[PDB]
Amino acid sequence: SSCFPITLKFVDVCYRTILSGVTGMISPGEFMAVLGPSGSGKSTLLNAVAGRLHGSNLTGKILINDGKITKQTLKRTGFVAQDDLLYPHLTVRETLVFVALLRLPRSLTRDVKLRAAESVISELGLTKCENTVVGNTFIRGISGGERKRVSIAHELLINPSLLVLDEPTSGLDATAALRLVQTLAGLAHGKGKTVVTSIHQPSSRVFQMFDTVLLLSEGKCLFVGKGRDAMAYFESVGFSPAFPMNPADFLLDLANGVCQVRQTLVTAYDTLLAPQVKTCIEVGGITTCIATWFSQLCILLHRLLKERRHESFDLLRIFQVVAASILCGLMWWHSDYRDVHDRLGLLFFISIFWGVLPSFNAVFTFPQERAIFTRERASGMYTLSSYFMAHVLGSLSMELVLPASFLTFTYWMVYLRPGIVPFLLTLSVLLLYVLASQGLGLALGAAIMDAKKASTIVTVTMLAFVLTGGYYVNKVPSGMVWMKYVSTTFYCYRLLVAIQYGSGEEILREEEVIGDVGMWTSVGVLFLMFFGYRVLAYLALRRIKH
Amino acid sequence: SSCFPITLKFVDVCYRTILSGVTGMISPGEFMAVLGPSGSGKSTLLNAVAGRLHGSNLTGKILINDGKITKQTLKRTGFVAQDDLLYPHLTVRETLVFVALLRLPRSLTRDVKLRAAESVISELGLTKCENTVVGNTFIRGISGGERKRVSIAHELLINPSLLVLDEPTSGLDATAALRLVQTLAGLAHGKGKTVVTSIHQPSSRVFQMFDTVLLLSEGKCLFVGKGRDAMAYFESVGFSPAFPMNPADFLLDLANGVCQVRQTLVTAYDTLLAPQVKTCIEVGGITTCIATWFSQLCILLHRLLKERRHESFDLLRIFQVVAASILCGLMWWHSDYRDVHDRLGLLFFISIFWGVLPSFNAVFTFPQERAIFTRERASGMYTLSSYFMAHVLGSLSMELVLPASFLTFTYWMVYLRPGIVPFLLTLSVLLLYVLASQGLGLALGAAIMDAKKASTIVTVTMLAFVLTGGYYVNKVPSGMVWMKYVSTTFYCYRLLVAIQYGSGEEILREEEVIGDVGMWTSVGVLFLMFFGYRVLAYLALRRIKH
């Protein structure tokens, strides 16, 4: 792999000071480690050499193969970050299949996009756990050193020629962190890539696997050399250990003061190594762009299918609906339609329960997956308009199966109106109201992007929708009668009474409670709240500038 | 300190195998490290040598100063565990003052119990942050290496002569984990104590601070010696490194296979070191016991005072009560008492809101602090009956200030009955109902001890209390009329109507809604649910056998 070499030179990097004159070169086929104490800015060097600091404070010359950070050579570079962002309910094989269908170019087949995702599984040693779910801290999945190899496989699908990693071995074991360094040395030696990593606290034989070492001590680097003459260099200045110790622990003490002194390391670097490195340092149309959109939406629906039915079918949401079905069928068992005060309280309990329950569970959707979206939209996998519509279409399928089972169990126990026409009109109003209540939660969760702070604002909003719905207060004090024309509970409840009683005179053989609004101007407003709360959630997610 | 030495011998420990013949002795004034791979059972050795495995599977001779694990010599032993259990809202000084008032003996003054808690602060180096709050991951407090010194200070108040620690330096920094080992070597050398610790992955100069080393490789130990002749012993068998490396990394490779082989280490141990260690291995009344109880309750009230007002006065619970006060004063503004259907809906909204809101927030109390309670009750600081009554008395003070401010703002806006006698009877019924609704949440949170699983059972229970309360369903189908005699919402709502309308005939100048239950048999049942739900929470916490 990678028969197209690369050479990375970063002459005089200065970031504002964090970095103050870092200079070195990275030949193709080398495995380099950036060593430094926690604060020297060894994470800032990796981002500003992979093209993540966009020339604002970065005053240096990051030139890639005697060039620049032009986008033609930036698609040959992968940056593996420090935290892992994976979906739990996908297995290891189908994690890397949906990523290969989104990242690899559109002018291929589906044949060599599945053989490009199984040549990456059986190269990082993931062929044992490929049918095991990924999981998280709450789902029994895969181990944390084998969870890191899925993040590295996510970057090797596009076949990069420069791989930049940010603390791979961190939290891993003693022997899991050695086999990971042994494959990263197998990429740089066997394939011919160029790996630049930053190891925090290496070990006695992890330091033997390295090839070149960079030592940062708050800005100015102290040593750039081939990783086994590091201990023979500092004894020429006059620094040497006493007790037998790790060669990586002797260097990380010279980086912060403790010797066996910090200022003479900086002066001796600019007189013997910096003259040595800097002499060598110069020598489709319209039909294409629509079918690309619908394929981004069909992959993102199947990729998120297992996540949506984890939200809407756990056993603590089924138990709240089975309980409310039994308590309604036992309180209003074989109810009579001639006592109007009881049946109007049945029809208002349905409006409270199915407006509070869809709106509350919808404010957790977008703040839960924000780091996953902003990492993957910035990497060119998908846009916002196809990510968003895969949540709109995928949530109006799973959220319409518990209210449809509530009503079937309950409709002929409590003796509502008999017939197939009053039953299918009562189900249609109930499912339109669940979709209008859900979009109010999606609009408040996206505008605020905090799940605990928006959970109390949907409480206060839905408390005012119930009180102005038309059941508790029979006469409203004349500066509050405007308030019922914005609530979803008012328009649902006037439609349920119009189906069960009609115009009103059929029971007259209690008139302000069977009053007049209109049956076509109540379904017309529940569609304006269906479409209108989904548009205000798109515009609230458009504001997040990456 | 510790002018009463101790000598720990643990001849032939075998635990069922985890441990299979561990044998050694620990002289007074030594700092010993137990080294081993993750799985060798170096945590099981520390618990079974501090007296935490109670002779069931532990088939060995744990003898302490040629004795046994009799309770007279077990109060001279401190075991610092691995995770830290601290209250966040207490500062560092008053954390160690409440612990000193509970652990030190009762036959002292309060003078030398505060000078015994400030000679521990200015000995572990906590005199800089003594006025800084402890915090957690969510509150900005103190650093995680300085959070560990508060756990060690918790065990040095009783002045032990054997201190046993379980991975102290874990998650700490490179230089924070060196200064912690330097004070633990200052206890064993300067004072004269006996420190036995188990370090996971030590460093190059952390290994120089040790004095004796124990090396466990799955059961049978491989080396017991004075920590600087460890590398000169294995080269006499014929094992030696090649590249320069940490002496703790060479040993932890011989413990699992990897050499520069595992079975010849076990045989060579039982022929040269085991004959060497085993030749030396033999040569008040009634007024006292009540005032002790009331002092445990006065300390535990002030210790938990800052935690109770974090629960009941955050800005997301104040915003739900200010919103409901405004929505009630605007919907029923200057209401009239002659339209009875509106005022009965005002009095039923108060019963729903103040039964759902106290019961929901009470199921989080006991599962939140279970590891703190079971650690500290087992250590002899307090019992269950004084820990429990400090939550009962401390929660009926802070939970009666938001419903008392709700009613004062609202009572003369919505024009309920004028006078000081109908106002103080309406406040008294509302505060008795809040205390009865709270105990139902405490009983369900303690029986289940899971905050998410009990949060849906208080939902289903309080949904059935509302529907059988007496407002929605006017006639109940004759097998469900028993169900209203167990709900708290029924007994509160019949008392509010009896204060605002009375016997009923005063408005008769709508009779099943101003019916008959009794005003003394409704306050008598709200006290039986006050006391009865608190007794069922004590019996549900009594079942947890440590």
PDB file of C-alpha atoms in Angstrom, chain B residues 117-270:
ATOM      1  CA  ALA B 117      -8.008  16.997  62.835  1.00  0.00           C
ATOM      2  CA  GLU B 118      -5.668  19.912  62.146  1.00  0.00           C
ATOM      3  CA  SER B 119      -2.532  17.927  62.954  1.00  0.00           C
ATOM      4  CA  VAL B 120      -3.533  15.646  60.068  1.00  0.00           C
ATOM      5  CA  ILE B 121      -4.194  18.488  57.632  1.00  0.00           C
ATOM      6  CA  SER B 122      -0.773  19.998  58.331  1.00  0.00           C
ATOM      7  CA  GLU B 123       0.973  16.635  57.982  1.00  0.00           C
ATOM      8  CA  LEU B 124      -0.183  15.408  54.558  1.00  0.00           C
ATOM      9  CA  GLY B 125       0.286  18.837  53.022  1.00  0.00           C
ATOM     10  CA  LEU B 126      -3.354  19.894  52.797  1.00  0.00           C
ATOM     11  CA  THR B 127      -2.867  23.273  54.465  1.00  0.00           C
ATOM     12  CA  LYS B 128      -3.168  25.182  51.176  1.00  0.00           C
ATOM     13  CA  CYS B 129      -6.571  23.877  50.078  1.00  0.00           C
ATOM     14  CA  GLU B 130      -8.244  23.589  53.482  1.00  0.00           C
ATOM     15  CA  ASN B 131     -10.795  26.293  52.587  1.00  0.00           C
ATOM     16  CA  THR B 132     -11.459  24.934  49.079  1.00  0.00           C
ATOM     17  CA  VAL B 133     -14.556  22.830  48.432  1.00  0.00           C
ATOM     18  CA  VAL B 134     -13.987  19.196  47.537  1.00  0.00           C
ATOM     19  CA  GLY B 135     -16.209  19.026  44.472  1.00  0.00           C
ATOM     20  CA  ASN B 136     -16.533  16.200  41.984  1.00  0.00           C
ATOM     21  CA  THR B 137     -16.532  15.860  38.199  1.00  0.00           C
ATOM     22  CA  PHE B 138     -19.409  18.392  38.106  1.00  0.00           C
ATOM     23  CA  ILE B 139     -18.266  20.907  40.759  1.00  0.00           C
ATOM     24  CA  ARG B 140     -14.931  22.716  40.481  1.00  0.00           C
ATOM     25  CA  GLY B 141     -13.105  21.441  43.549  1.00  0.00           C
ATOM     26  CA  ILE B 142      -9.631  20.041  44.252  1.00  0.00           C
ATOM     27  CA  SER B 143      -7.199  17.989  42.212  1.00  0.00           C
ATOM     28  CA  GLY B 144      -7.314  14.201  42.038  1.00  0.00           C
ATOM     29  CA  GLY B 145      -3.951  13.679  43.715  1.00  0.00           C
ATOM     30  CA  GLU B 146      -4.999  15.995  46.502  1.00  0.00           C
ATOM     31  CA  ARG B 147      -8.369  14.243  46.697  1.00  0.00           C
ATOM     32  CA  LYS B 148      -6.470  11.056  47.581  1.00  0.00           C
ATOM     33  CA  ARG B 149      -4.774  12.708  50.557  1.00  0.00           C
ATOM     34  CA  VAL B 150      -8.184  13.384  52.095  1.00  0.00           C
ATOM     35  CA  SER B 151      -8.925   9.644  51.972  1.00  0.00           C
ATOM     36  CA  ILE B 152      -5.610   8.928  53.699  1.00  0.00           C
ATOM     37  CA  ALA B 153      -6.342  11.625  56.287  1.00  0.00           C
ATOM     38  CA  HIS B 154      -9.648   9.853  56.995  1.00  0.00           C
ATOM     39  CA  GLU B 155      -7.693   6.822  58.259  1.00  0.00           C
ATOM     40  CA  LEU B 156      -4.959   8.669  60.178  1.00  0.00           C
ATOM     41  CA  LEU B 157      -7.376  10.282  62.628  1.00  0.00           C
ATOM     42  CA  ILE B 158      -7.497   7.128  64.772  1.00  0.00           C
ATOM     43  CA  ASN B 159      -3.644   6.870  64.685  1.00  0.00           C
ATOM     44  CA  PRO B 160      -3.174   3.389  63.189  1.00  0.00           C
ATOM     45  CA  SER B 161       0.041   1.427  63.405  1.00  0.00           C
ATOM     46  CA  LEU B 162      -0.584  -0.562  60.208  1.00  0.00           C
ATOM     47  CA  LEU B 163      -1.664   1.321  57.087  1.00  0.00           C
ATOM     48  CA  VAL B 164      -2.752  -0.760  54.084  1.00  0.00           C
ATOM     49  CA  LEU B 165      -3.391   0.998  50.775  1.00  0.00           C
ATOM     50  CA  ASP B 166      -4.947  -0.368  47.583  1.00  0.00           C
ATOM     51  CA  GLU B 167      -3.442   1.309  44.463  1.00  0.00           C
ATOM     52  CA  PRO B 168      -2.926   4.892  45.692  1.00  0.00           C
ATOM     53  CA  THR B 169      -1.163   6.202  42.596  1.00  0.00           C
ATOM     54  CA  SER B 170      -3.692   5.371  39.900  1.00  0.00           C
ATOM     55  CA  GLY B 171      -4.854   8.057  37.510  1.00  0.00           C
ATOM     56  CA  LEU B 172      -2.465  10.516  39.163  1.00  0.00           C
ATOM     57  CA  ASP B 173       0.159  12.443  37.222  1.00  0.00           C
ATOM     58  CA  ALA B 174       3.854  11.756  36.771  1.00  0.00           C
ATOM     59  CA  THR B 175       4.963  14.138  39.527  1.00  0.00           C
ATOM     60  CA  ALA B 176       1.842  13.958  41.679  1.00  0.00           C
ATOM     61  CA  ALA B 177       2.383  10.208  42.019  1.00  0.00           C
ATOM     62  CA  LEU B 178       5.974  10.728  43.156  1.00  0.00           C
ATOM     63  CA  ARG B 179       5.193  13.173  45.958  1.00  0.00           C
ATOM     64  CA  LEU B 180       2.508  10.829  47.276  1.00  0.00           C
ATOM     65  CA  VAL B 181       4.983   7.944  47.506  1.00  0.00           C
ATOM     66  CA  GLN B 182       7.416  10.301  49.247  1.00  0.00           C
ATOM     67  CA  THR B 183       4.974  10.982  52.093  1.00  0.00           C
ATOM     68  CA  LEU B 184       4.112   7.293  52.444  1.00  0.00           C
ATOM     69  CA  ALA B 185       7.827   6.673  52.838  1.00  0.00           C
ATOM     70  CA  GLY B 186       7.848   9.516  55.357  1.00  0.00           C
ATOM     71  CA  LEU B 187       5.265   7.732  57.485  1.00  0.00           C
ATOM     72  CA  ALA B 188       7.156   4.443  57.586  1.00  0.00           C
ATOM     73  CA  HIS B 189      10.577   5.997  58.219  1.00  0.00           C
ATOM     74  CA  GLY B 190       9.882   9.098  60.290  1.00  0.00           C
ATOM     75  CA  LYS B 191       6.928   8.028  62.410  1.00  0.00           C
ATOM     76  CA  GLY B 192       7.546   4.294  62.633  1.00  0.00           C
ATOM     77  CA  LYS B 193       4.431   2.850  61.048  1.00  0.00           C
ATOM     78  CA  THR B 194       4.120  -0.186  58.772  1.00  0.00           C
ATOM     79  CA  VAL B 195       2.909   0.662  55.268  1.00  0.00           C
ATOM     80  CA  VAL B 196       1.897  -2.056  52.786  1.00  0.00           C
ATOM     81  CA  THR B 197       0.868  -0.758  49.369  1.00  0.00           C
ATOM     82  CA  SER B 198       0.243  -2.211  45.915  1.00  0.00           C
ATOM     83  CA  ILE B 199       1.515  -0.070  43.051  1.00  0.00           C
ATOM     84  CA  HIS B 200       0.225  -0.877  39.570  1.00  0.00           C
ATOM     85  CA  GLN B 201       2.794   0.407  37.047  1.00  0.00           C
ATOM     86  CA  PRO B 202       5.585   2.147  38.931  1.00  0.00           C
ATOM     87  CA  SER B 203       8.180   4.438  37.429  1.00  0.00           C
ATOM     88  CA  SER B 204      11.937   4.632  37.229  1.00  0.00           C
ATOM     89  CA  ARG B 205      12.419   6.588  40.454  1.00  0.00           C
ATOM     90  CA  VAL B 206       9.235   5.469  42.193  1.00  0.00           C
ATOM     91  CA  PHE B 207      10.900   2.034  42.313  1.00  0.00           C
ATOM     92  CA  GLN B 208      13.868   3.626  44.086  1.00  0.00           C
ATOM     93  CA  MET B 209      11.636   4.833  46.933  1.00  0.00           C
ATOM     94  CA  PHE B 210      10.581   1.290  47.853  1.00  0.00           C
ATOM     95  CA  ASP B 211      12.172  -0.760  50.585  1.00  0.00           C
ATOM     96  CA  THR B 212      10.924  -4.349  50.159  1.00  0.00           C
ATOM     97  CA  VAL B 213       9.197  -5.871  47.121  1.00  0.00           C
ATOM     98  CA  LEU B 214       6.710  -8.736  46.754  1.00  0.00           C
ATOM     99  CA  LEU B 215       6.204 -10.178  43.253  1.00  0.00           C
ATOM    100  CA  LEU B 216       3.032 -12.174  42.570  1.00  0.00           C
ATOM    101  CA  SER B 217       2.675 -14.158  39.340  1.00  0.00           C
ATOM    102  CA  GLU B 218      -0.770 -15.786  39.645  1.00  0.00           C
ATOM    103  CA  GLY B 219      -0.671 -17.027  43.180  1.00  0.00           C
ATOM    104  CA  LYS B 220       2.776 -18.228  44.168  1.00  0.00           C
ATOM    105  CA  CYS B 221       5.113 -15.332  44.836  1.00  0.00           C
ATOM    106  CA  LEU B 222       8.476 -15.185  43.095  1.00  0.00           C
ATOM    107  CA  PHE B 223      10.629 -12.840  45.199  1.00  0.00           C
ATOM    108  CA  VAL B 224      10.594 -11.401  48.736  1.00  0.00           C
ATOM    109  CA  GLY B 225      13.590  -9.171  49.317  1.00  0.00           C
ATOM    110  CA  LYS B 226      14.869  -5.701  49.960  1.00  0.00           C
ATOM    111  CA  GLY B 227      14.056  -4.033  46.656  1.00  0.00           C
ATOM    112  CA  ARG B 228      17.548  -3.232  45.376  1.00  0.00           C
ATOM    113  CA  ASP B 229      19.003  -6.749  45.186  1.00  0.00           C
ATOM    114  CA  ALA B 230      16.098  -7.869  43.002  1.00  0.00           C
ATOM    115  CA  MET B 231      18.097  -7.455  39.802  1.00  0.00           C
ATOM    116  CA  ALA B 232      21.130  -9.185  41.313  1.00  0.00           C
ATOM    117  CA  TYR B 233      19.076 -12.259  42.225  1.00  0.00           C
ATOM    118  CA  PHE B 234      17.604 -13.175  38.847  1.00  0.00           C
ATOM    119  CA  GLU B 235      21.007 -13.007  37.145  1.00  0.00           C
ATOM    120  CA  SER B 236      22.162 -15.728  39.547  1.00  0.00           C
ATOM    121  CA  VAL B 237      19.455 -17.989  38.152  1.00  0.00           C
ATOM    122  CA  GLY B 238      20.422 -16.762  34.677  1.00  0.00           C
ATOM    123  CA  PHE B 239      17.845 -14.129  33.709  1.00  0.00           C
ATOM    124  CA  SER B 240      19.019 -10.679  32.619  1.00  0.00           C
ATOM    125  CA  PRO B 241      17.757  -7.882  30.342  1.00  0.00           C
ATOM    126  CA  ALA B 242      19.410  -6.759  27.109  1.00  0.00           C
ATOM    127  CA  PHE B 243      18.451  -3.134  26.441  1.00  0.00           C
ATOM    128  CA  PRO B 244      18.472  -0.566  29.284  1.00  0.00           C
ATOM    129  CA  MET B 245      15.132  -0.739  31.026  1.00  0.00           C
ATOM    130  CA  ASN B 246      13.161  -0.084  34.186  1.00  0.00           C
ATOM    131  CA  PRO B 247      13.804  -2.683  36.932  1.00  0.00           C
ATOM    132  CA  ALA B 248      10.060  -2.811  37.564  1.00  0.00           C
ATOM    133  CA  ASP B 249       9.355  -3.606  33.905  1.00  0.00           C
ATOM    134  CA  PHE B 250      11.833  -6.479  33.875  1.00  0.00           C
ATOM    135  CA  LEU B 251      10.103  -8.074  36.864  1.00  0.00           C
ATOM    136  CA  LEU B 252       6.592  -7.653  35.464  1.00  0.00           C
ATOM    137  CA  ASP B 253       7.687  -9.486  32.315  1.00  0.00           C
ATOM    138  CA  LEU B 254       9.084 -12.444  34.273  1.00  0.00           C
ATOM    139  CA  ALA B 255       5.732 -12.559  36.067  1.00  0.00           C
ATOM    140  CA  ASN B 256       4.001 -13.378  32.763  1.00  0.00           C
ATOM    141  CA  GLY B 257       6.236 -15.451  30.524  1.00  0.00           C
ATOM    142  CA  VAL B 258       8.186 -12.864  28.531  1.00  0.00           C
ATOM    143  CA  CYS B 259      11.910 -13.174  29.193  1.00  0.00           C
ATOM    144  CA  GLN B 260      15.197 -11.901  27.784  1.00  0.00           C
ATOM    145  CA  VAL B 261      10.744 -19.717  32.075  1.00  0.00           C
ATOM    146  CA  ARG B 262       7.695 -19.036  34.255  1.00  0.00           C
ATOM    147  CA  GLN B 263       7.875 -22.522  35.777  1.00  0.00           C
ATOM    148  CA  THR B 264      11.563 -22.431  36.738  1.00  0.00           C
ATOM    149  CA  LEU B 265      10.918 -19.235  38.709  1.00  0.00           C
ATOM    150  CA  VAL B 266       8.421 -21.056  40.927  1.00  0.00           C
ATOM    151  CA  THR B 267      10.751 -24.000  41.579  1.00  0.00           C
ATOM    152  CA  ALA B 268      13.758 -21.778  42.301  1.00  0.00           C
ATOM    153  CA  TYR B 269      11.709 -19.746  44.791  1.00  0.00           C
ATOM    154  CA  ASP B 270      10.794 -22.762  46.938  1.00  0.00           C
TER     155      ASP B 270
END
